[PDB]
Each structure stands twice: as C-alpha cells, then as structure tokens.
Amino acid sequence: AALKVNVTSAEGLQSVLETNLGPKGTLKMLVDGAGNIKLTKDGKVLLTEMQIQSPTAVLIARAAAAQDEITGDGTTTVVCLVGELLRQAHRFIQEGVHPRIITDGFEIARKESMKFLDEFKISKTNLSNDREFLLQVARSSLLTKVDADLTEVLTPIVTDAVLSVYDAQADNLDLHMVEIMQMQHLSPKDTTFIKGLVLDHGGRHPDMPTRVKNAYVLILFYSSADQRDKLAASERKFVDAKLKKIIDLKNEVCGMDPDKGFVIINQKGIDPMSLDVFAKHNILALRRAKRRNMERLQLVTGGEAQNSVEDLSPQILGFSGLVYQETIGEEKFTYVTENTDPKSCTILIKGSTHYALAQTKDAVRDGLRAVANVLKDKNIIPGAGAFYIALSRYLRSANMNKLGAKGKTKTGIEAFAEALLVIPKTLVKNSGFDPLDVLAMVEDELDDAQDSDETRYVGVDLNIGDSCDPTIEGIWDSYRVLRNAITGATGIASNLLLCDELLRAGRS
Amino acid sequence: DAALKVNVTSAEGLQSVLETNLGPKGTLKMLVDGAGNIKLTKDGKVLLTEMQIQSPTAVLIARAAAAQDEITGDGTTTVVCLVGELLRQAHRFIQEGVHPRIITDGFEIARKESMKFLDEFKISKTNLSNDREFLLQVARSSLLTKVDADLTEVLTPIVTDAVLSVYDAQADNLDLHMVEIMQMQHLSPKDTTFIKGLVLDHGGRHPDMPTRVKNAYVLILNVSLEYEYSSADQRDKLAASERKFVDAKLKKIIDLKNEVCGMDPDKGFVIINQKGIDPMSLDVFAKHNILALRRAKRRNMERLQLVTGGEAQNSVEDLSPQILGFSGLVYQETIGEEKFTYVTENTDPKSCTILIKGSTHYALAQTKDAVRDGLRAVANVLKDKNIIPGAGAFYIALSRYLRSANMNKLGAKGKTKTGIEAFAEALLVIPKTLVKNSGFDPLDVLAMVEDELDDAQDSDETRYVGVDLNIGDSCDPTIEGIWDSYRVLRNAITGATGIASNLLLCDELLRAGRS
Amino acid sequence: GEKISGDDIRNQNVLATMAVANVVKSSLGPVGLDKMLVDDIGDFTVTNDGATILSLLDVQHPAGKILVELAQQQDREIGDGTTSVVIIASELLKRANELVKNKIHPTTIITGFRVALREAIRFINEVLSTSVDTLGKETLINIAKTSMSSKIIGADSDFFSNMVVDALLAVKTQNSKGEIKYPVKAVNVLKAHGKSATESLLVPGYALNCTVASQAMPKRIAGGNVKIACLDLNLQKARMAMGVQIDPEQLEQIRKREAGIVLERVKKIIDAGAQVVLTTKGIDDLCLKEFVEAKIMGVRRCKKEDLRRIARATGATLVSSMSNLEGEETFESSYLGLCDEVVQAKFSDDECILIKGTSKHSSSSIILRGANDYSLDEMERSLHDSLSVVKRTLESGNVVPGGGCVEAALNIYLDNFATTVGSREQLAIAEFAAALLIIPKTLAVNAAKDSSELVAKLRSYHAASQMAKPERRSYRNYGLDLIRGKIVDEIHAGVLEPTISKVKSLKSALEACVAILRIDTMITVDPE
Amino acid sequence: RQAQISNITAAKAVADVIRTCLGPKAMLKMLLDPMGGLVLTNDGHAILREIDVAHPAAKSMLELSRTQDEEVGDGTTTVIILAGEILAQCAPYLIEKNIHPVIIIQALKKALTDALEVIKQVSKPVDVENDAAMKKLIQASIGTKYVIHWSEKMCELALDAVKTVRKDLPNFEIDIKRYVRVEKIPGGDVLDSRVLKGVLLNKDVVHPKMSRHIENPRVVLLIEEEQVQLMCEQILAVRPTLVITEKGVSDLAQHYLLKGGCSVLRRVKKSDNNRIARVTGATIVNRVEDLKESDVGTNCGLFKVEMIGDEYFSFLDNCKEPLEGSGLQKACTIMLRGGSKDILNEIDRNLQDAMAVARNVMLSPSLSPGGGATEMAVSVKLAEKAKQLEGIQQWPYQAVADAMECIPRTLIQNAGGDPIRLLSQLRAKHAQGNFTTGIDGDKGKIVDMVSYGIWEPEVIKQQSVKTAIESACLLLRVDDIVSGVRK
C-alpha cells in the first residue's frame, strides 16, 4: 500500500545534481546562514548543508562519504542512478514485479561489471614517473571543476607536487603533504608552486634579514604596595631567562658575524624586548607562529622540533641553501628553496575573492586525491563515459551467456543497461545538444570498432557533439574511481529496492 | 514547458477507473448518487456521467467514447487503457528531448501500417449460411465482459436467435427494427426468457376486462380521451353534456365492432389511449367484451405494423379495418398493478421482443445495460462479413512486426523509431490488464505466449495464439471461439490515434477568465 | 457635516486640479499622444480630447467639476484644440498659492487678472492677422495644415488638407436673416475599415449608409429630379384594445383587413413617384414583396436621427402616419422634394445613397476609410472638431500664429503694462505673464527638447519687433519649429490658428481661476 | 515609465500564448474558460476573443485579429503572431533610448515602403484557374491542422468550391461566402461527403405514418379541430409535398396534413428558412393564407433519407440548374460528415479560410515565396538599408529586422531545430544565391521553396504586414493609462 509512496516522492531527487555533471555543466549557488558562499560542482558540499525534503536523501548523502575518501568528483552518478531506478519502478515494478526480483538481477550484474571492468582498463607504468601521462590526466580532471585558465596553471603544479613524494616502493601518502595555504592575493591564475617549504610568518622588524642563504631555525598577598612590585619584577625575569640563554647559545657556530640568516619560531607570545637584543646579532623572531607546520623542517635541513628553550642542540640548527621572504599584505611569507633533498612541498594558492578561492580550494583538494590513486594503482580507466556506454551494450545482449532465472532476471538486466545510458545523455543535455543524435553516433562507433577486429575505446566530445578518443583527448580515470563507485552503485540501488514500507509515527 | 507535465500527471489517474472493468474476467464497481439510483455496471458511459472529475482532460476521454458507442457500445475500456500506457510513456520519451509531435507523427505511420496488416490477420466468414456455432462463440465472449456466467449461458441462445430474425439477401440490418425491451420485476433475473413474437406492456384495468382471448382487435388512440346561468337548470345541462362527447364515440364503437361479425363476442378487442380514460366508457366496454387501458404509452404501438400489419391511429375520425389487427393466441399475465398482455402464434413476425424479468431496479439495470450493449455489438458482426480474431491476439501479433522493421519501414533515425517502439509496446498493456483482472501474473503468461509465437513463426505455420484467463494458459481464438468484428477493431485503433494526438500536442495549460 | 476652513481647502483644490491636469498635458502640441482610461465597466476610449475625458473621469473633490464644465463650454464655442486650451487655466492655480500666502487680497488677485485680460484684447489686436495677410492661396489649406496638429493624424496631412476644404465649400447656406455661414454639425462623417485615408470619398451632399432589404430590388437609380419619402409609420400586426378585448375566420379577418390596407397604403406611395422610400421598423416578407413590385427603393431598420436631417436637407415632409383632412389614408404629392443629382455608389464592400444638390438646405458628408475602429476613434473626434475651425476661419478672417507665438508675445506687452499699473497689482501681472509662458515651455517637454533656449531666443525676436515702431526688416521675426528647434516664420511652415479660438480660450480661463479663488471653505453633507 | 510598463507587459505574455499556433508543427494549449468548460484548439481567433486579461490595453489588440479576419480573412495560421510580435523588439527602446515613440512612426513608415519593394522583387505570376499549383497552394495554408491525413480529400472540396459558388459579377471573384452553408455531421468518415445543391436539416418528422421520399418537391416555409383543418386545406390547395414551420406542430395538424401526402418539420431556425427560400425558390410565408402557386419548388432533383442510429435527419439529393453569370448570389452547399468533433471543427475553420485565402489568390494573381522565406528575404534588404541609412532613426529601423527574423524562428522552436546555424545560413544564402531559400516544414533544411512546393500570395504578405505595422502603433501612441475612472 505504502510501497509506492517512497518511489514517487523520492523520484524528484535526480534533478538536484542532474545539471552538475560534466565539464561543460553549470554551477549552483549555495549560501548558508553563516555567510559562507560555496559555488562548486562538488557533491560533498551540496549534499551536506542543503536542506532535504524526502527522508530518502539521508542515505544518498551518506553514500557520498565513501566517495569522498576515494573519488569526490563526479559523485552525481550516485543520484542519477537512483532517479532512473525509481522511474523503472513505475514501468517494470508497476507491472507487478516483486521489488526483490529486480534486485537480484543487479547483484548478479555487479559481478559481471567487475569481470568487464578489468578488460576495459588500460595499464600504465608509474615507476618511470612519466610526466606526459600525468599532464593529460590532471588536465581533464580540472575541466570538470574549473575552467581552462586555472587548468593550465594548476596542471604543472599538481604534476610536480606528486613527484616530490616517491620512493623505491612507490609509497605516496596523502597524509604527508597536507597543509595548503589559502589567501587572497593578485588573481587566481597567479598561483605559484614551491618545491620547498613555505612559512606563513616573517620578519616584523626593519633590521630582520630580507634575503639570506643559510638559516638556523630555532623552534619554540603583600603587605605594602612596594612589595607588589617585587612580583612584577620576578615575572619579568621568567621571560628574561629565556631570552638571555638564546644570546649565548646562538654563539655556538658564529655569533660574532651576523652575515648569515637566523630564525626563531615560537608558538606563544614572546617578550617584545627580543627584537631589540636580536637586532645586534641580526636574529629573526616571529609573532604567533603555528606548531604542526614545524614537523616538516626535519625533512629538509635535518633539524629537530623543539618545544621549550632549555634543550638546544646544534642538531636542531640546519643548513639551508637559499631563503627568500616576500611581503604580501600584513603577513610576510618566508620561502625555503634550493633544498638538497626536500621530502615535501607546500601548496600556495593566490586568489581575489572568497568565492574565487572556493572554486580553487575544492579543485586542489579533489585534484591531489585523484592523482594519488593514479600513482598507487597503475591501472587507469578511460573516462568520458566510455565504460557506461560499453557495459550497457555488453549486458544488453546476453541470452545463453549470462541469464539466470528466466524472465525474472532479464527484466532487471534491461533496467541496469538503460540506467547507465542516462549518464552520457546527461552530459549532452548539459551541453545543450540532442542526446538522441549524439548517442546514435556513439553506438555506431562502437559497432564499427568491434566489427573491425580491433580493440578501441571511443569517447564523447561535448564541444562538437561527436565521438572522440579519450586517449588522444587525455580524459582518464583511476581504476579505484569506478571500483568503489560501481560497488557502491549496487548498494545505493538495493537500499530503496529492498525498502518495504515507511510509516508516519514517532514520539512528540 | 513547466506546465507540460501538469496535464500529463493529472490525467494518469484516469486509467484505474475502468481498469478493473476490462475483460471477461473483470469485476464490477459500484457508483451510487444522491437521487436513489444504484448503478452497478462495467459500462463507462454511466460511470463517467455523474462522477465528479478533477483533471479537465477526462472530458475529452468521454468525447472519444461517443464514436465508440455508435460503432461498438461495448468494450470501450481499451480506449482509456491505451492512453494510460501512453501517459506513462509520455514523460519517458519526451524527457529525452524528442518533440511531442514527432511521436505523434510516428503513430500516423504505425496506424497506416496497422491497417495494411489488419486485412491479413482477419478471417473472412460467410453470414449467409447462418452458422450457429460461430454465433454462439462470439456472443459468449461478449456476455462474459458484461454479466456473470449464470446470465451468460441463458442469454447466449437469446442473443443468437435474436440477430437471426433481422437479415436479408442484401445484408440489410436495421438497428431500429428490433429495439423495445420489456422491463418487468418478476421471479429472479436469471429467469429471463426470449420471445420471437411481440409483447404488450399494458393490460386490462377493470375486473370485467377479458381474461383470455384468441383473435385480438387493437384500436389505437392518442389524443386525450378524458374530457374536462339564469337558473340551476343550466348547471344540470352543462354537466350532462360533458358525457355526451364520450358517449357519441361509444355509439360508433358498438356498431363498427359488430359490423364484421357481431354474433359471438368471444374474440379479443382492445382500445389504447395515451391519457386517462373516462370511467363512463368502462360500462360500455364491460358488456361489449372490450379491453380498456389507463395511461398507456405510444411508441410501442408502431410494432404492430412490422408483424401483423397494424396501424397506430391518432384521432377518432379515421377508423378502418387496417387499424384492427389479428393474433393467433393471447396470454394475459397479471403482475403488480398493471396486467401484461402477450401476443404469440404470429404468422411471420419480423421482430423479436426481449422479455426480461427480475427482482428490483439494480438487478434489472445490469441486464438492461447488457442486452442493449450486447445486441448492438453482435448486430455489427452481421453487417461486415470480415471477422477479426479476438482475445487480444492482434495486439500482440502486430507488435512483433513493429518491433522488427529496419530496412522495411524506417524513415528518420531515432525520431520515427521512438514512436515505433512506443506504439509497439503501448498495445501490450491490454493483455497485461486482462491477466491482472483475473488475479494471475501477466508477465509469466505473456512469456509463454511469446515462446509459443516464436515456435509457431519458426516452424513456418499460420496460427493464432490467444490467452485463456480461466486456466491461466495460452489458447487459440479459433478453438475457443473468441472473435471480433472488423469495424470494431479498425475504429478502435484509429479512434485511439485521434484521441492520443489531443493530449500529446497540448503544449501548456493556461488559466484565463473572470474569477 | 464635515467642514474645514483656512488654506486647507484651497491647497487640496489646487493639488487635485493640478494632478488631473498634468495627465492631459502630454497631449499638447503635434508631439502629443493619446491616453487610455479604464472605466472598470468594460468600456474604454483612447483620445486626447479633454471634453470627453473630463466628463468620464470621476471628480473627487467638488472643486474639480469647475474645470469639467469649462471643457463643456469650449464645445459650444469652438470645440477644437482642447489640448491647448483647458491646460492654460490650470497653471493659474499653481502660482495663486504663493499670492494667497502674501498679504494680497483674493479680490486684488482677481482684479489684477481682470485688468490683465481686458487690456490683453488690444495686445492680440497688435499681432492680429487680417483676412488676406499672408499668401493664403485658398486660405483654407493654410489653416487645414494647422488643424492636423494637436492630433496624431498629421502624417495624413497630404490628404486631409484637401478632404476637409473641398467638402465644406458646398455647405454655404443663407440663414439667420440673410447671414452667410456654414451650418456646423450638419456634416455626417462615415468610417470604413481597410486600406488607408487615401480611399476616402467626398460627397457634396448627404450620404446615408444602408442597403436594400431584398437582394432582388434594384440597387441603382440614376437621373435627375429624384424624389425621396421618409415614412416612419410602423407596419406590424396591430395590438388589441384597452383590455376589453373582443368565428376565428372573422378574427383572422382583422389581420386580413389590416394587411390589406397596408398593401393599399403602399399603393398610394406608388402613385407619388418617389424613387427612394424609407421605413423605420422592420417588416416581414409580405410587405417586403410589395416594395419589390412598387419599383421603389426601400430601406428598413432606419434610425430616426438619420431621417431628421434628410427632411431638412432635401425639403420633403417627414410622414410618420398617412392621413389627410378627410378620413382617407393616402400620400399627397406636396410632401416630396427635389434634388439635383441622387445616385447610390458602392464603397468598401457596401453601398450608400448619395443625395446631392439639395435646394432646401445645402450640406455635405465626408465618407472616410481607415484601418479599424480603434484607429479611427481618434480620427473621428478630431475631424468633427476641425469642422469648427474652418467655420470660424471663413466667418472671421482674424487668425493668430500658433506654436507658442501668442504666449511669448503677451509677456512683452505685460512687462510694460506691469509698470504702468504698479502699486500692489504689479506683482499680479508678473505672475500672470509668467503663467502664460508655462504652456509653451510644456510644449517642448512632450518633444524632449529645451524650451528655455527657444523662449529666450523667440522672445528676443518679438522684443525687437515691439521696441522698433518704424522697423526694411533687420529685426522682426516669429514662429517656433518643434522638429528643427529653430525660429522661422510660420508663413513657410503654415501654422496659423483663428483669433476667436484664442480670445475665447483666455476669456473663459479668467472666470475659471476666479471660481477657485472665491471659495473660502467647503462643506459636505453625508447622503441619506 | 509608470504607465509604459503596463502597456508593454500587456501584450508581452500574449506572444507566448499564440507562439504554438504557427507552422505545420503548431501545437495546442489547454485553456479553462470562466463558463466552467474547456477550450483546446490551435486557432487563436476563438481564443483571443474568449480570453480575459487584466490589462484592457491588451484587449484592444484582441480585436486586431478579428479586424484582420474581416478585412483580409487570413493570418490565423502565421501572421496572428506578427500582430503581437512587433512589440517584442520595441521593449529595449523606452527603457534604453528614452525617446518618444514618434520617431518609431517615421521608422516604421520607411520600413513599410522598403518591405513592399522586397515582396514585389520576389513576386511571380501564377495561373489561378490551373489546378496544378492551386492544389498545393490550398494544402499549404490548411496543412497545419489535423486534416493532413485527409488533406488530399479536403483539397478536392476546397478546389471545387472556389470554381462553383464564387463566379463573379468585371471585378475579380467578389461575392459573399456567408450564404454558402457547410453541414457538419459528426461520426463516420468524409468519404460520403458530396457537393449537394439543396439544404439538409437535422429535425425529424412529426408524424409516424408519413413516408420519406419525393420526386418533384413543393416547399412551403411557414372549434380548433375544424379551424386548423380548414387551415390545412389552404396549405394543401397547391398540393405541397413538404411543409416547414418555425414553431411547433400540433397533433391535430399531423392527421389533416397526412391526407395531402406531405412531410412536416418543426423547430426550424430562421437561418435555415433563409437558405431554403433561396435554394428551393419558395418564398417565406408569414400569414398562412398568403400561400400561392409562386412558392413551388425549383431545381430539386431527388429527395433521400440520411438517418443516424438515434434520430432522423432531412437529406436532399444533388441536382443541377438548366441553362438553355449572376455570381452575386449563389445557392449551393457542401455536405461534410466528420469523424470526430476535434477534426470536424478544424475543417470548418479550414474550408472557410481556404475559400478566404483562395479569394485573395484570385484577387492578386501574383505569388510570393511562402513558408518563412519572405520574412528572411525582407530582413536582408531591411538590414542593408539600415547600414546605408546611418542616422538617428537607424536604431528603431534596424530593430524591425529582428522582428522579420523571429517569424521563422517561431517555426524553428516549434519544430525543434537549431535556429543559430539555420538563420545564419539563410541570411548568408539569401544575400548571395537567391531569396527562394527557406526553412523546411519538417526537417528544417536549406531546401528552396520552389522545389518544396509552398508559396504564399503577394496580397497576403503585403496586407498582413502593413496592417500589423499600423496596428502595432496603437499602444505606441498611448503615452498614459488611467485606472479607476468609473464611468
């Protein structure tokens, strides 16, 4: 009785993310009550703070959690599959088919999708660290988020960033390079990559060194009114004991000639007198400097992160090749370059406004994670919806190959094949062309490729609305992209199909 | 085009109305108004009359049944069923970006190709030999779609013998030749008896009226028989003169009746008036053995000419022996407050009278609606000798030719093919509804039909495969005897195409007017 | 009731009259445009004429009805150019509020305006134009091009200039004890859909729009001495008595005897000899068949007002019933008139009988064809108003240059007149002279031009004319061009307006502003 | 700008209502009337008259379509949008240039003269009597309706009508089409439709004994027992075979008139009596005693019986007129048996418009490219004169070129093609190859109108555009609107 309630109501959920798919797609404005403007095609932001009507959207929003740690881009396929699945219930299930009959056909098709998944993928060699292949993958990856202006700028940035993280075992961890600077400066296209480490603070005094080569980094009841001044005099000696020990300990290597660079970094506030006593020795100090960013200094100059001022050893002070400082706004940045063997890089993003950084911040976080799966797994799958169209034709004609229960499974087989065809039609609809004529040309290219006794992968060009080659165009997806998506595509489908009845009740 | 889906979604709920009333195994739906009329029937014309509708698009659905009532009158449920499947396919293929008129143009091509294969699927039969086996099988399928099996076995020889009375060498069938149906409350509805003669609906209102007669002389009247100072002597003369107008006509009846033979008043004589009767005339009618009536109808008088050659007279000026008829035997039955006269033993009656007895109004309303809808459907079968195998065999067989076309009928690529696959699968909802009304699985039955048609087509043999809803298996419409007239199916497909173009070509809904 | 005293009444009256005045100011001059009024009853009329608009517009404060009656008085005097007339008195109320705030007595404001207009009569006589004056080829064509202004029909001036002039030449009659004048309002204007104004037809006489009832009747009558008979007698089955009422054959004989006499009444018309007969009320085919055998052209469904002008122009006696000194019903031959030429012509998928050469009363009709009804709504009232200007032109040859020439000239005369009177009335003359200059300033507002640039140059040319009495001409000049924004003599542009129209405009505008200045308070009694 | 917004937004929503009424791809729109019913049709002439809008300024344009139908009689297929299309491109004028509409009046007059010259450049003569081009010309105007199936049969009725009931007085084809009657019978097929010389009636016979058939008809258009009997004797004095009266028929008159062997009808409207009097030659009789020998029937061949399964109808067979010319008044009718009320109402609108279009065909034998080629052909020269003008008036003048390009654009959006590359190719092809290039009615291709077989008369192009431009100045000449006048 109430089975048709959740089918009809949740059907209108596809139009939410429908137009957010594809590099030629459009954008949607989302503004919360706190004043945060997020304009992006990303599904994690659009499915989080946005208010939902049908309760079925809870499992849809939670389904993207597994895609955030794996893909994070193109997550609209989760919603597009559910919308087409519910429209199939008004056709196949409306005929009286039990909801589990069509469910079993999708579970069988899941194993068949994995068998055809290894044949469609193309293996690459990641041991040689070929940049030509990385420039093409990052290119098309940024086209689905930002325009070609930010794509050409960020393509060598992401390519050169993942090359600094590597080993003989090809170990690449996203937890290694994490910190990314977010600031409004110049224009978004002016983003510059640094092969070394970037500091967010700099010299606050005119006598501080502007440009140096080597830098030593030091990481950090009274009865009368006259008796009350004794406590104020003793509390000043507490911070004085920290500053007086620095003057003597920095004399270790050379304290007489202040011709090199000197660095002192502290987490909390420091006595402003330090600027006066350090001006004679040309020692640099910082005001309100962070902490976690100090752990990266051990991977360049071989230093050691220190907490207090009591323990100071020459092992903490390292040798840097070149140190540059740039003054931007009210916060100067200290750039560490010419490193012997840098183990990490810092991403410095420059932009104009807040919404301009919202598009870049979503692109860099999703860009670095997508390239991570490329180096981890050498298998790379051609993109541009080439697999969704091919798999639909492989399962369309089966008969004696894969059949199962006669007439019960075949009904669900045709539903899974026609459901995957909505994604390429969505790509054409967002571009403004006719999906009927474009799909008819794509089907002819696959038929001409199979009849020519040659293995070929044909893509979809959204600019001219014709077929193309994902290899020549450069569109590529990682193997783990469709591995967790298709596996999750069956789970998101079985949620509503195996759902029986929802009752209105509760504790007021 | 934001308002395009408004009329599509609102009109989708119109399918479930008659969905359960389709097929021989279909069920009944009760519709009762506030005036005290209880109508239980599968006919859509009555159900769509007093029922309040929400979406205005249901008005065009009722207008589509106007042409179906004249041509068919029974089995009109398939008109809205083909629209319901179209509405489910409406938002499907239109969402793909195909213009609605492109799908409409595809139906025009499919309709022309359907008429080409329509002549090959039908089986020509000869109505001159008057085959009883063919009539009993066709009438059986029509009765099961209206009433139950109890009235089906009773009305099967009734409808068969009724259409055999109206026929000629020129195939002249007059629907107005046999019309009048006798509505009576007697015994049970299953006791309905067929009569080849003529039945009168009125009988003697006085105890002295003739109880049993042989040769009856009918005198038909129309104009109202009932008629409406210096001293009180004038008041007595005016009231006495009121009866002189009626008594003047009574003296003529006495002499003109005894004219031919006045010796033995052992035969029948009947005077029939439209308005009330003067009680003064009953005294003359009693001693002269004259049967009289009170508040008698008119149109029933025209049936005396088609059998015994009678004449319905209006005024009292013209009296001729042509007005007075004859009868072989007369059996008068007294039911309720109005006696009933039966005219039997006719020489060569050209029209049969349907005598329907029952319990109450709603019991008679089921049979009265079934006879009028069942007789006009069989009457059209004898008009055209071309007969189409029924039981939904054509809807499934035609789809097989439409699904595979390619170089035969193609046209545009994807523009026409969308309408071809739509109309091919739009005709498959009828056999799915027939099985759903029976309580079985429509897909498991259809899967066995498709497997049977594949075995018959590959074997290179001509065969018609139907669907038996009683046992839930496949059958042959020729063996079971389910058939359909040519004009019924031809105007149903053509009529469904015209009504489909109305909803598909509506671009937007507009509200304009004075509140 | 509700009674308020003080300046609150005069303030609410001026603001109410000024609000409704600014609505009709957009129609001033040739660049003006029509406006639409929503009556909420389903009827609407788009026109620039203030006589109809002020009559349709609901007057809120009772003081606004004074300006409404002012437009009704212009119809009885001139009736044309209402856009340039009724807006003159509206500006006197705006500057009057500043004088009320002063110590000047309201009658002193009135007295200052009385001596201003009384002396302004001689001011008009200085710039006054004689009958000949400029070239004046037919002297009508020069004025006909002026009547095209103030309206949207100016684009058709290549035609209407010849239409109105050539039609009104035959209207001259002898009436009012040997006085030669044109009987205005006797001209019938017809409208036809399709084509343009170039298809209009000029009828030197009366033209009635109607056809024959039966198609078998002859539609063509040619030759001279054509007699016409207007019969308003209703031919129908007679009703019964006062209610006393009364063999159905003798009862049916009542209709047989009546219809028999009706056929005899038509036979009396046959012996008259009239070619055209008219019938007001409709008839059946029995009496229509008799008109076919009568060899006389009949017409049914006739309007009574149309036949009243027929008996006046032709001279025939209108017969509502057939009777004589005796008890015999007949038609005498002395009730028929004569005409020079009568012929029926086919125009715009229709036909109309042209009655020309009327001896009793001479007149003319103008049959015009146009786009449609809504397009001819403005062209209808405009042509009916232009008939008065042509009348006043040949009745009195005095005309004045239009386009702000009079208002700009009167300022110079009042500048020397203000210092002449002096005392407290000198300020009233200055405010009265500045109020007359507002009308030509609002003329360029509708044209989206600079009026003060033209007024400063135009007044300087009128000043050089008055400052030099002896004058060849190195100074004198006048006229204002709206299209080119230059000063050129109106003799070349052809814009001249009759003097009698402008004199009566300012004469009636005097008492219009005084009626508001004489109101001390306003009280309203609640209705029952 | 206070009163100008109300005038612009009044006709702005009207364009979207009738946008689906143009071209062979024209669609329908469901409208809910205040009467409580529904009106679904693709013809705006009935919609614009029955539509209720809040702004009365739009009501003035609702009568413009009726005026074009009375004066011309065409434009409901295409030009119906052009009446409200001119105001679409006039919106970026007052809000941008802030100039009085007077400048547009001079701009439209110069554009109207140039538009008439372009139509005359592509104008070509064609024989009106030759049925070669006239067959496809009639189907061109009516090919936008449901008649496409029967358009082969529907063209036969329209082609034979203009050559029969029209004739002439000599001036053209001029005649009146209102006296020509078209009988609409629902149900069945149009295969039984014939050209009949006599009147059909839907009213049954009052008496059961009267037999229905006639050889040589006599038509009479019209205590108590003996009085009516004597009245019947006066009616039967000429021995009529048919009696028709507008009032009811009493039961007494059924028996008395039965002795004369005549047919009696009742409830006949005066509109039918006027046609029967002309066709049968009889004279309408008011007073019963006026019946004479002059009312005898004339030129009626045979009488038959056409009966629906419900009741009886009057049917008169075909005949002819012995000659052994006077085209001002003709007596004839076309019997039409329609399949359904949806297509039946469209054929009556098509047949009356086809005779109205074919009228203008024979009024101006010249012919011009149709199907949307002329509107794009004018826009080539209309935009060319704009660049040659080079003045202040160029802005309102060049804006008219957009109105000419949007007329075929409406057909593009209805067909579903891409107007970008299509219209860009038309403007380049017309300015180079020829003006005959146009949009296909189905595929929307560059195929020329010469080989495609669609054409439109010159008078249809000149008068409709000239009227639409002059009618568009209505709201342009309205500077203000006042609400709450309360006449």
Residue numbers in the entry:
A (entry chain Z): 17 to 236, 252 to 539
B (entry chain z): 16 to 243, 253 to 539
C (entry chain a): 17 to 262, 266 to 490, 494 to 550
D (entry chain g): 18 to 186, 194 to 246, 275 to 376, 430 to 592
Could you give the paper's own sentences about this structure?
The TRiC/CCT complex assists in the folding of approximately 10% of cytosolic proteins through an ATP-driven conformational cycle, playing a crucial role in maintaining protein homeostasis. TRiC is an ATP-dependent macromolecular machine that facilitates substrate binding and folding through ATP-driven conformational transitions. It consists of two identical stacked rings, each containing eight paralogous subunits (sharing ~25–40% sequence identity in the same organism) arranged in a specific order. An individual TRiC subunit comprises three domains: an equatorial domain (E domain) that contains the ATP-binding site and forms intra- and inter-ring contacts, an apical domain (A domain) that comprises the interaction sites with target proteins, and an intermediate domain (I domain) that connects the other two domains.
TRiC-ADP-S2, constituting 22.8% of the population, shows an observable conformational change in the A-domain helical protrusion of the CCT3 subunit. As a result, an enlarged hole forms at the top of the dome of TRiC, making it appear slightly more open compared to the closed S1 state. We first compared the S1 and S2 states and observed that, in the S2 state, the density of the apical helical protrusion in the CCT3 subunit was absent. Corroborating to this, the CCT3 apical protraction exhibited a significantly larger B-factor compared to the other subunits. These findings collectively suggest greater dynamics in this region. As a result, the A- and I-domains of CCT3 exhibit an outward tilt from the S1 to the S2 state, with the A-domain tilted up to 16 Å. Overall, these dynamic motions of CCT3 appear to initiate the opening of TRiC’s iris. A conformation comparison between the S1 and S2 states reveals a most obvious upward movement in the NSL of CCT3 (up to 5.2 Å in Cα). Indeed, the NSL of CCT3 exhibits the highest B-factor in the partially open TRiC-ADP-S2 structure. Notably, in the closed S1 and the opening-initiating S2 states, the N-terminus of CCT4 bents and extends towards the outside of the ring, potentially forming contacts with the E-domains of CCT5’ and CCT2’ from the opposing ring.
